[PDB]
């Protein structure tokens, strides 16, 4: 889903939904190819080990200036009317230029 | 007991500098690091920088190249010296003093600090005195019109503040290089127009004093 | 750097309920050996205070109503029972690493029962009408909701031009709102019809507030 | 039709600060949550570009140092940091009534250091003398400020008929100002006397910038 | 790829109609408008009107009747179709793209659409050369003097634009049915008289270019 051909826009973000597979965190986070690797609710080091019962991939692309206002609660044109964060959102967020 | 008032500005164009004078008092400077604030410009509330005991001092990221801390310890007072404002920046700026775990216990009342390329203007008091024909049911409402002044703040207090009862500030209208203040105070009938009503209009800003009988 | 995206923007909690200010976190971990931090309050009417420090203990001079506690990321600050001293912006920092930025602030607004605006119109001063200019105000205060739109209709009609309005946030300890409408003309205009009105529609008063006010009045 | 007062008309910022520009505004409020406006840049020989649109949103394909905000009415253009290439007029666009005008215009200059102009002179060619006129060609090009008075004053007197300038303000690239001045005289007045004069006194140099011609060369 | 440049227009006489066409290329025209205004005479830029996506067209209430656009869909073309143009109907046309919020995202080059009873009249193009007195300080100035000239544009180069830094542009002067345009080309002081310095002169109206060498 990260190196796919293209993704989508802001607006008609891509909610790939997966479940039923292993997913290695830590390797990613110690990875060196992410320009942000921010996470809410709970540290990248310590949520490589945990069972959940689904997880989604929002695929879409915003500029530089705008990276920062995907975060919950955080306002901006994206933020309120394009993608909408949940407030509570326990996962995180990656980016990479 | 406790003192953390600021003053020293009365207006300042945007990309100049300027030097506030904050008045310690409860607390040694030597027993706790004086810290620095704003007051909501915009989006939520912005720190600037504290000076630490005896010590350096940290700043924050976007402010440190530009305000700087300047901590009178013999005086009893912390003066402030900024840089490169912008009109975003108009806020009350405060100084508190330092808590246990790095907190902000004591708060003081501050001065809002404008940044604008207008000029400063005094106030032109106009009272808003009801007529012969105005009526009355066991109480009466009065307040001023304070428009033409620049910069904020402004505070109008009836017979230099002896009414506290039905007391009510509303917010300054932006007008063109000037500002626009209306008040409103609840008194008894029997005050007025009985006894001598005048409405007492202050600019800290220009230090103004305007008197107008109600 | 730390982004405290603190939500709501806002609340509505009427009195004697339970209000919930969240406050987000990035970083960071052992503030003192936790991963706790403070909380604020800034009055429209007072100057600020503090209300909690690390997030789980009281501070003299505030009430112990407010209280909460918080994860690495998610905080919360809980503040039950709502009196009428909780109308403010509320605020959390963190001190573990500059910059000590605060949160995006959550007003508080006490959500009372609503009450219709008061009712005191002002004709121009002496100075004023000796001067050529003529500026009635007509306040409308104590209300609830916010929510309030005067119309300024002369007689002849409707004037929008030198109509502004004075928008008052919640008082601390008042609960009530209150807004100022002025209109700022000449003496010919005041002297330009006998009566005047100024309406008003506010969610309270089902029917239209209406009070007119004669140019005699001097 | 709404006539956008934008305020200053003309700016000189230096090197490394930051440039405000107002761009007033009467009419409408509050289209969908907002006002705003968009902004441009026209250069001195090339149409305008967008920079900001509603006042709050970056444009790609233009330098990053541009910003803003602004209010229901007043509007701000932000350029930070200002550097040698902002050489150019900036306007503020009418977008919620028709129709789309624009405001006054400020005309924005990079303060740069005090430079002398050249020193030279063109003679015209053969044919044009040999028709009777004469086109004498004065440059001063590449010097700082713009204040400078240039004036022809032939051996006999101060010319008064044959004084014509073409300024060139301050360029993108080219930070400096440069003035051609041309001479208009006929044949008999352009061999009238042997030498002439081009004088031109700049604002820094109390000596005149001179550069002479006779009538031979050609 | 984006292309909205004009052509057609070279001179119009008093009492005429023409229409400018600006190519359109790079977005759907469809799915943006064309938008039309003058390069600010007198006061501020000036807007004349905007077709709408697939909807209606605007225009100012002095160029309703003279002045219409026509967006052809099928050729991407948009026409600006001119009528009753007298001498004080002047005017510079540019194109530009509709953005989101009624925004000119893209921009082209342009039309000087000069209205005029005289006739065209080319230009009278002389090469600058500096005088025995001038001096050099390893930089030696050179120019092409392209006087007499009517109407604009017209564009003058050094090499057919092999420089572009060194080549200095000016004002030209308005005259009575005529212009007289100034040029400078800055070059060391080693390469004239040694080397071939050939001036290029374009004035797309008259579709003249006289080559003179310096």
């Known amino acids: 889903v990260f190196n796919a051909t293209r993704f989508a826009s802001v607006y008609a973000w891509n909610r790939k939904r997966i479940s039923n597979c292993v997913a290695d965190y830590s390797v990613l986070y110690n990875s060196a190819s992410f320009s942000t690797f921010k996470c809410y609710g709970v540290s990248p080091t310590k949520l490589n080990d945990l069972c959940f019962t689904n997880v989604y991939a929002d695929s879409f692309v915003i500029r530089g200036d705008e990276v920062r206002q995907i975060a919950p609660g955080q306002t901006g044109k994206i933020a309120d009317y394009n993608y909408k964060l949940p407030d509570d959102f326990t996962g995180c967020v990656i980016a990479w230029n | 007991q406790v003192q953390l008032k600021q003053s020293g500005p009365s207006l300042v164009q945007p990309s100049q500098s300027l030097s506030i004078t904050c008045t310690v008092s409860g607390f040694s400077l030597t027993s706790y690091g004086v810290h620095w604030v704003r007051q909501s410009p915009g989006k939520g509330l912005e720190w600037?920088?504290?000076?630490?005991?005896?010590?350096?001092?940290?700043?924050?990221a976007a402010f440190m190249s530009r305000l700087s801390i300047t901590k009178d310890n013999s005086k009893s007072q912390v003066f402030f010296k900024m840089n490169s404002l912008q009109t975003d920046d108009t806020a009350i700026?405060?100084?508190?003093?330092?808590?246990?775990?790095?907190?902000?216990?004591?708060?003081?009342?501050g001065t809002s600090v404008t940044v604008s390329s207008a000029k400063t203007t005094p106030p032109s008091v106009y009272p808003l005195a009801p007529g012969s024909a105005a009526q009355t049911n066991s109480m009466v409402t009065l307040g001023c019109l304070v428009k033409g002044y620049f910069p904020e703040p402004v505070t109008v207090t009836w017979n230099s503040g002896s009414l506290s009862s039905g007391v009510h500030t509303f917010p300054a209208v932006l007008q063109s290089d000037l500002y626009t203040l209306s008040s409103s105070v609840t008194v008894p009938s029997s005050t007025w127009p009985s006894e001598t009503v005048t409405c007492n209009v202050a600019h800290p800003a220009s230090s103004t004093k305007v008197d107008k009988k109600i | 750097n730390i982004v405290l995206t603190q939500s709501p923007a806002s609340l509505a909690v009427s009195l004697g309920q339970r209000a919930t200010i969240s406050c987000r976190a990035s970083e960071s971990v052992d503030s003192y050996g936790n991963s706790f931090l403070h909380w604020y309050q800034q009055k429209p009417g007072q100057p600020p205070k503090l209300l909690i420090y690390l997030a789980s203990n009281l501070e003299s001079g505030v009430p112990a109503r407010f209280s909460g506690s918080g994860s690495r990321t998610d905080f919360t600050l809980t503040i039950d029972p709502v009196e009428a001293d909780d109308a403010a912006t509320y605020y959390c920092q963190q001190n573990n690493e500059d910059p000590f930025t605060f949160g995006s602030g959550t007003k508080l607004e006490i959500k009372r029962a609503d009450a219709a605006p008061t009712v005191s119109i002002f004709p121009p001063s002496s100075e004023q009408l000796t001067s050529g200019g003529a500026s009635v105000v007509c306040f409308l205060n104590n209300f609830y909701p916010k929510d309030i739109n005067v119309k300024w209709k002369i007689d002849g009609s409707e004037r929008q031009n030198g109509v502004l309005n004075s928008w008052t946030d919640q008082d601390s300890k008042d609960s009530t709102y209150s807004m100022s409408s002025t209109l700022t003309l000449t003496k010919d205009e005041y002297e330009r019809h006998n009566s005047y009105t100024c309406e008003a529609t506010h969610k309270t008063s089902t029917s239209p507030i209406v009070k007119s006010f004669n140019r005699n009045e001097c | 039709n709404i006539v956008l007062t934008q305020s200053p008309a003309s700016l000189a910022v230096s090197l490394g600060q930051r440039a405000t520009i107002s761009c007033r505004a009467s009419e409408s409020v509050d289209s969908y949550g907002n006002s705003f406006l968009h902004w441009y840049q026209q250069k001195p020989g090339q149409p305008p570009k967008l920079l900001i649109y509603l006042a709050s949103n970056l444009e790609s394909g233009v330098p990053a140092r541009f910003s803003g905000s602004g209010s229901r009415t007043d509007f701000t253009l932000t350029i930070d940091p200002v550097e040698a290439d902002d050489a150019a007029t900036y306007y503020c666009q009418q977008n919620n009534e028709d129709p789309f005008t624009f405001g006054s215009g400020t005309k924005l200059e990079i303060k740069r250091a005090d430079a002398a102009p050249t020193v030279s002179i063109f003679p015209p060619s053969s044919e044009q003398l040999t028709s009777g006129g004469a086109s004498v060609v004065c440059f001063l090009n590449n010097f700082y400020p713009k204040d400078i008075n240039v004036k022809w004053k032939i051996d006999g007197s101060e010319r008064q008929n044959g004084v014509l300038n073409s300024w060139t303000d301050q360029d993108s690239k080219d930070s400096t100002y440069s003035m051609s001045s041309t001479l208009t005289l006929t044949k008999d007045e352009y061999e009238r006397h042997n030498s002439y004069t081009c004088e031109a006194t700049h604002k820094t140099s109390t000596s005149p910038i001179v550069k002479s011609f006779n009538r031979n060369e050609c | 790829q984006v292309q909205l440049k004009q052509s057609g227009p070279s001179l119009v006489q008093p009492s005429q109609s023409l229409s400018i066409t600006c190519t359109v290329s790079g977005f759907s025209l469809t799915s943006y408008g064309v938008h039309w205004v003058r390069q600010s005479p007198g006061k501020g830029l000036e807007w004349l009107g905007v077709?709408?996506?697939?909807?209606?067209?605007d225009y100012n209430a002095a160029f309703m009747s003279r002045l219409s656009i026509t967006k052809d869909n099928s050729k991407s073309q948009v026409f600006f179709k001119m009528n009753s143009l007298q001498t004080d109907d002047t005017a510079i046309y540019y194109c530009?793209?509709?953005?989101?919020?009624?925004?000119?995202?893209?921009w082209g080059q342009g039309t000087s659409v000069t209205v005029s009873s005289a006739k065209t009249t080319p230009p009278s193009v002389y090469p600058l050369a500096p005088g025995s007195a001038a001096q050099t300080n390893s930089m030696v100035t050179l120019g092409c003097l392209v006087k007499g000239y009517f109407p604009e544009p017209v564009t003058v180069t050094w090499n057919s634009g092999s420089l572009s830094s060194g080549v200095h542009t000016f004002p030209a002067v308005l005259q009575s049915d005529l212009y007289t345009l100034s040029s400078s080309v800055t070059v060391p002081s080693s390469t004239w008289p040694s080397e071939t310095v050939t001036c290029n002169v374009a004035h797309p109206a008259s579709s003249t270019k006289v080559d003179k060498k310096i």
């Open positions: 530009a793209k509709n953005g989101g919020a009624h925004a000119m995202d893209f």
């Open positions: 077709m709408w996506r697939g909807g209606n067209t």
